[PDB]
Amino acid sequence: MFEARLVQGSILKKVLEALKDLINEACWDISSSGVNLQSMDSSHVSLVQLTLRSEGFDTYRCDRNLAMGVNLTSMSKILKCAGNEDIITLRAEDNADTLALVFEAPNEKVSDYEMKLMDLDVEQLGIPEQEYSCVVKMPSGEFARICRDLSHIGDAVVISCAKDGVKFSASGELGNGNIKLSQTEEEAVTIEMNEPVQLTFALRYLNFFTKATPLSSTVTLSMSADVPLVVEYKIADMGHLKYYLAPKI
Amino acid sequence: MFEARLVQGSILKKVLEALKDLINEACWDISSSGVNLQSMDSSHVSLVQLTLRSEGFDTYRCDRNLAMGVNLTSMSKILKCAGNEDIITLRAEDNADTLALVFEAPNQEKVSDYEMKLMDLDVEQLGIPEQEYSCVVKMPSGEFARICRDLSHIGDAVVISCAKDGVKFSASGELGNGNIKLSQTSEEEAVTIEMNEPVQLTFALRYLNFFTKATPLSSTVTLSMSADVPLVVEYKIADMGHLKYYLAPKI
Amino acid sequence: EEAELELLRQFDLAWQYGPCTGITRLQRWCRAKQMGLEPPPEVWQVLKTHPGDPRFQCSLWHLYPL
Amino acid sequence: VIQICSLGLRWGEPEPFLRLALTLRPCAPILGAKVQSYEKEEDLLQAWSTFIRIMDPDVITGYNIQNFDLPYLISRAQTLKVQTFPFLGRVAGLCSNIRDSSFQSKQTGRRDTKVVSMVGRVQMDMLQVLLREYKLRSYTLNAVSFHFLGEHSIITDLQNGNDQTRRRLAVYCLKDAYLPLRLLERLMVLVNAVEMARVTGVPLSYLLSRGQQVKVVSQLLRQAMHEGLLMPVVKSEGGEDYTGATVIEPLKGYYDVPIATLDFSSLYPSIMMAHNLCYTTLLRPGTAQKLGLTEDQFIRTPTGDEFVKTSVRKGLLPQILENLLSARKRAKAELAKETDPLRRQVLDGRQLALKVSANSVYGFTGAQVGKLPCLEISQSVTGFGRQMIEKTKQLVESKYTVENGYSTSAKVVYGDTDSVMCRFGVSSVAEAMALGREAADWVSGHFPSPIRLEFEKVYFPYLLISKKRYAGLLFSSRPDAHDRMDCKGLEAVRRDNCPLVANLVTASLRRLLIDRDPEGAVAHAQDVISDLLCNRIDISQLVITKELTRAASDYAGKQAHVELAERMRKRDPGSAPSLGDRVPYVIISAAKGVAAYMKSEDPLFVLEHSLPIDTQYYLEQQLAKPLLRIFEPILGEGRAEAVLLRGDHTRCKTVLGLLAFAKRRNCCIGCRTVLSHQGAVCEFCQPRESELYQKEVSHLNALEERFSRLWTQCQRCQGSLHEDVICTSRDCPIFYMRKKVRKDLEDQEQLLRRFGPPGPEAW
DNA sequence: TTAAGCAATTCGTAATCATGGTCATAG
DNA sequence: CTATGACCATGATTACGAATTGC
Ligand SMILES: Cc1cn([C@H]2C[C@H](O)[C@@H](COP(=O)(O)OP(=O)(O)OP(=O)(O)O)O2)c(=O)[nH]c1=O
Ligand code: SF4
Numbered sequence A: 001m002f003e004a005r006l007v008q009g010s011i012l013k014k015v016l017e018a019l020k021d022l023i024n025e026a027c028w029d030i031s032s033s034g035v036n037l038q039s040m041d042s043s044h045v046s047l048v049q050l051t052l053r054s055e056g057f058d059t060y061r062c063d064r065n066l067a068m069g070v071n072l073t074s075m076s077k078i079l080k081c082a083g084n085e086d087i088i089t090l091r092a093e094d095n096a097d098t099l100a101l102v103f104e105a106p107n108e109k110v111s112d113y114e115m116k117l118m119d120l121d122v123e124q125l126g127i128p129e130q131e132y133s134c135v136v137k138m139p140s141g142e143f144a145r146i147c148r149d150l151s152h153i154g155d156a157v158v159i160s161c162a163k164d165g166v167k168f169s170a171s172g173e174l175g176n177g178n179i180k181l182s183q184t185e186e187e188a189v190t191i192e193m194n195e196p197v198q199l200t201f202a203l204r205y206l207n208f209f210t211k212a213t214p215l216s217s218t219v220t221l222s223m224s225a226d227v228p229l230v231v232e233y234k235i236a237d238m239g240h241l242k243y244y245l246a247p248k249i
Numbered sequence B: 001m002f003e004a005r006l007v008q009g010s011i012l013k014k015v016l017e018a019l020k021d022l023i024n025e026a027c028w029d030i031s032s033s034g035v036n037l038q039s040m041d042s043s044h045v046s047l048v049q050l051t052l053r054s055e056g057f058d059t060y061r062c063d064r065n066l067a068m069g070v071n072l073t074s075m076s077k078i079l080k081c082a083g084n085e086d087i088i089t090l091r092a093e094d095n096a097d098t099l100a101l102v103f104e105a106p107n108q109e110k111v112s113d114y115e116m117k118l119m120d121l122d123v124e125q126l127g128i129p130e131q132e133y134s135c136v137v138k139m140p141s142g143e144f145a146r147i148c149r150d151l152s153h154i155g156d157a158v159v160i161s162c163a164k165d166g167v168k169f170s171a172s173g174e175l176g177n178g179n180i181k182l183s184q185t186s187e188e189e190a191v192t193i194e195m196n197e198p199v200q201l202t203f204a205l206r207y208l209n210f211f212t213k214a215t216p217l218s219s220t221v222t223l224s225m226s227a228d229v230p231l232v233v234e235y236k237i238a239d240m241g242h243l244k245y246y247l248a249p250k251i
Numbered sequence C: 001e002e003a004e005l006e007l008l009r010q011f012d013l014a015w016q017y018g019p020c021t022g023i024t025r026l027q028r029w030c031r032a033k034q035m036g037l038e039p040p041p042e043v044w045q046v047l048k049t050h051p052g053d054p055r056f057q058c059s060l061w062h063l064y065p066l
Numbered sequence D: 001v002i003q004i005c006s007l008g009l010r011w012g013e014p015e016p017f018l019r020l021a022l023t024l025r026p027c028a029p030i031l032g033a034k035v036q037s038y039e040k041e042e043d044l045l046q047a048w049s050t051f052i053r054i055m056d057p058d059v060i061t062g063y064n065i066q067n068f069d070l071p072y073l074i075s076r077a078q079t080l081k082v083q084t085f086p087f088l089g090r091v092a093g094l095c096s097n098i099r100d101s102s103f104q105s106k107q108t109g110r111r112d113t114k115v116v117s118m119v120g121r122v123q124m125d126m127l128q129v130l131l132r133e134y135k136l137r138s139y140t141l142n143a144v145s146f147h148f149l150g151e152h153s154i155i156t157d158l159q160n161g162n163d164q165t166r167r168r169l170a171v172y173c174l175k176d177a178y179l180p181l182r183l184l185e186r187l188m189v190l191v192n193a194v195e196m197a198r199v200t201g202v203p204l205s206y207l208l209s210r211g212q213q214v215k216v217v218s219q220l221l222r223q224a225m226h227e228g229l230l231m232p233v234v235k236s237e238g239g240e241d242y243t244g245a246t247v248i249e250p251l252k253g254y255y256d257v258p259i260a261t262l263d264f265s266s267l268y269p270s271i272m273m274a275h276n277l278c279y280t281t282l283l284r285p286g287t288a289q290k291l292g293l294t295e296d297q298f299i300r301t302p303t304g305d306e307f308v309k310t311s312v313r314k315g316l317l318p319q320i321l322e323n324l325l326s327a328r329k330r331a332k333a334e335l336a337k338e339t340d341p342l343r344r345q346v347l348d349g350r351q352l353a354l355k356v357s358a359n360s361v362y363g364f365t366g367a368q369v370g371k372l373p374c375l376e377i378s379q380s381v382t383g384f385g386r387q388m389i390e391k392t393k394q395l396v397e398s399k400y401t402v403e404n405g406y407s408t409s410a411k412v413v414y415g416d417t418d419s420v421m422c423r424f425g426v427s428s429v430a431e432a433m434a435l436g437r438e439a440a441d442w443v444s445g446h447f448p449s450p451i452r453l454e455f456e457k458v459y460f461p462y463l464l465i466s467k468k469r470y471a472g473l474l475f476s477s478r479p480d481a482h483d484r485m486d487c488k489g490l491e492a493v494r495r496d497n498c499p500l501v502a503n504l505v506t507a508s509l510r511r512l513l514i515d516r517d518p519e520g521a522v523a524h525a526q527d528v529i530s531d532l533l534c535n536r537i538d539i540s541q542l543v544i545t546k547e548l549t550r551a552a553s554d555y556a557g558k559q560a561h562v563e564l565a566e567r568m569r570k571r572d573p574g575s576a577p578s579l580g581d582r583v584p585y586v587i588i589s590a591a592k593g594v595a596a597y598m599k600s601e602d603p604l605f606v607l608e609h610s611l612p613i614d615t616q617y618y619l620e621q622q623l624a625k626p627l628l629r630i631f632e633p634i635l636g637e638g639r640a641e642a643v644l645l646r647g648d649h650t651r652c653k654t655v656l657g658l659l660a661f662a663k664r665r666n667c668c669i670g671c672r673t674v675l676s677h678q679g680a681v682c683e684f685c686q687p688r689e690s691e692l693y694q695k696e697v698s699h700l701n702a703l704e705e706r707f708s709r710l711w712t713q714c715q716r717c718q719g720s721l722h723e724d725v726i727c728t729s730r731d732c733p734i735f736y737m738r739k740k741v742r743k744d745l746e747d748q749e750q751l752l753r754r755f756g757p758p759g760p761e762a763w
Numbered sequence E: 001t002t003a004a005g006c007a008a009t010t011c012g013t014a015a016t017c018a019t020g021g022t023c024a025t026a027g
Numbered sequence F: 001c002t003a004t005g006a007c008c009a010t011g012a013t014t015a016c017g018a019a020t021t022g023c
């Protein structure tokens, strides 16, 4: 039997609105170490990796390692029938294919939904750990506006990481432009560099990646030679959320 | 070598937001008096005169009487990529047919440097007459936009009656007749209907909605009319110069 | 080279060594040698002075979805 | 040009008499044919020109010889400076030349061809004969040879090799050059061309270049010299349309009591015959006046004209039509004594052609862009048609009623401009057939002659969906119990869809109309949808084809096949669809939902590059709505919920740059839990392991049985058991169904090596 | 210089119109 | 720190052309 209880349902709603546009189906690997997920997008281009560690759930209980198959659209429709202050508990059997969600208001009103799961035949992939050599820590709002503003011109963007700062350039039929950023708490842009980087990535994927902006304040961008650019977010004493995207050749 | 700066630079966003829905192109006449723009409309009913004196700018270098042409809506789409506190800088070479826009930040950390290419222009140009305008009205711009939009949901074209005591904005429509009356109020919210001789005219209310696109563009709006002549709506671009929209009248 | 690439293309279509479009080139050379039909000692002496190159050590149609 | 291969016969003898093959390197002998070899191409082209002068043939055939073969030979002879090649004709001092031509009509569309000049000799490309007469799905030689009989870079290394490879190449080329002869003699092409030229009076070259106007001009002139009239020249751009045919409003649904069909045979030519309508007897509005003789000198039509009775004149179009009608009657009288099925349908093709000729006589009159239009006549024709069919419906529903001694008052359920489907009430097919024959013969006695109504069939049961969409089961006699189904208009006879959908509609109507079991039908549709979502459906069943017409209408609005065609390939900007052909494509999955014209791809490109398939596109856009047409009328709207719930129990079973950076996480075979180490079973589901090994070895066993049935079928379709298979035929289901079982077996063999080996192997 | 007709149903794309989530600023 | 409507974004309805088949 699985049963979790978490006091901040807002974190759950932000993570479920991170993913309902890029992914349609997923498999939750429920374990005794937390709730962990890997998936590819529908276009077979980008990777998502989500970790909610076991401690941050304020009442955890998991008997046996599970694997649930969830249609993310119906779940995203269910988690918007819960206000931003409620307390969310998850209830599952180890013999069943149907999940229970109970939302507890902090005042006379409690709500409970049952959702039918599906069996899927997906394959789970991962990533190996290497040292990306350009390490940027920047504000998330500026990154959202930079991607959204370059988007109207053309579709590719070149990232140009040099010593004092980074520089993003983009072209198109109505011209071109760049934006600089320089080394100078969370409104700073901390830039670690060993080897300089210049690479090209398409904008539709980046404007998908900047959908999960209310999860934190800062965003971490990691680059290296010829590897997929990593976009990383941290969720406070809960875990993290990573997107992965490959460069153009 | 043209190189000019504007610190309170939100006004350029504000003018080209009220420029692009009217007309698709503009004839930018850069003189040593500054930045000017006379241009007709597309429907052969109206006209825009923008004047930007040099004394309304900050830092200035003009070496040429440049006469260029801008496709407006792509320039507006580029101007949508900078905030309103951000400093607007323009750079131009008299041989390199491009515009180099430089958006400085007030905290100076985000730098933008955009470039729009040029296209040739052979635009028509007519001169406005100077005359006596029998009714000049100073009004709040927001109240004026509110009133003409309140009339937009009745009918299509407006009839105006300009006289001594009150001014009469009347209209018909598919639901019947309506009219609102105004009077003088005994610095920005003050009104004044300066009048010599009362008149009646017909104008297009949809072009008043087009002209009220410059609602946040001044302290007060000025409405100047006389008999059978283009109405000039005036938005005094504060400390800078002024934008005047002419509307040739109806018959 | 460019003369060694026609000797192998000639070894690959001689019908007296076998019907070979599913296997490697050196496997067919040793299959004929076991039965000892008559493999020639020159289609061996270019499969030794090369490493694992896919344009020497592969049959002619090792693309081609047949 | 490296090989030319030729077959030749005298007409009337059941085998050829000449079989020649001319190659460009030394070759190996073939039993039954002569083989000559040359060291240069100039000798090869000269040798072929001398052979074609000396044998001196009457007719030249082939397959795509006009647009590929002859201009390739002519251009290749021009490049190599051989002066004596292009004299192929009969006149001794004349050389041949390539010249473009176009044809267009609303009946066959528009096609652009080259022609090459040969005086004396006649050309019959069989491709153009197929493209003009037949409406098929693909027009490749493999596809029509399967439909009627039953079957570039490799060649360059079969020719740069040895002489047994060249002998294999020559046997392949001779089989190619032999297939169109067999098609020409089997389909009764030339006998029907000779009979068409004898009945119409036009030459034998006009039946491959022209339309249906020169023939009716010819017959009208040949009938005009016998009374001394001259034809005028009227030309107008342009008149208006007139009102066409009536359709009766249905009583839609599912019927299970027999309906009998009564129709008129040769309707419009007999209207034109039996009311004396012609150019030469059309009475102008004034020339009746001031004569007052109305009775039995002229008649009046529902559109309004007046036409002279036959006691004053005989028209010219009645006589031409009467000759064509007797020719078709003789063809049917000959067809009524055949026993072979393909022969029965080719005599049906002959009589169909003569009925099309007789109806195009009437359609000549209304063509305002033409040579002689008289829209007054056309309006009189369709007015008489409407009047007679409503007369039929009133009469049939009015006479046989409960008060008139009969059993039940009948009620007409449908009628479409020549036929009437009356529902009688009895559920015995013998009594329905008896009353229907009585009704047809009764109603026919209210007309001039040759106007006759006839019984044609009894449908039992019946399924009426809309206008021009229905289905039923066919009775010809009673002790001849049933013949087949009839599918008028539905999703099984159109070519704009997938084979999967047309097959599902045919199988559903089979299980639903023959066995009357809706539960097997639901289980069938469930299995089709389940096997769709589980990714075990062949890509032959997913191919869509559309015709690439004139380029400006496809400029006017963005389509999928136009986008695929105009997008060239990197490999070949010299082989691409042209105007008039068919483009095949499949739809792959992506995230551009605004446009289904951004997700289309060539079947061979998605074969070699392995792109996924959009199963939701095929589920909600191809399959779902035809099924909701068919399955609803037998039940309510709980049937829409029944099939969308059948889906719902079966929709929950779906099978699944950066792709190279895999981690390949192993998973438990029992409960799908990713874990460290390579063992197959999970620690909680470890005991139940003999049953989990038992399960899936019966799957490996069934994949092994499918590998062997397929990869030895290619050996029997190829001919040889000792040499390699090379056949990438895109119209064969065999190809790319033999490619995926290798990978299924590759995957299922490696899943069972998770378990140890069942013994040692080095002993 | 060259070409037989009309009736009807189905599906896809762009454009028109309705409605909610953020947000921005006046109270 | 908190109401109000103006602003952006996403989904439902209509229109028309193209394709193909039945009489
Ligand atoms: C098929 C077809 C029919 N029609 C008109 C003429 C026909 O008189 C009318 C009836 O269509 P059909 O029933 O198809 O043809 P038919 O009645 O003349 O001959 P039969 O009964 O022996 O099959 O439809 C045309 O004008 N052009 C055509 O191509
Ligand atoms: S793939 Fe095999 S069965 Fe299919 S056509 Fe080719 S040789 Fe024949």
Ligand SMILES: [Zn+2]
Residues within 6 Å of the ligand: D668, D669, D670, D671, D672, D673, D681, D682, D683, D684, D685
């Ligand atoms: Zn397990």
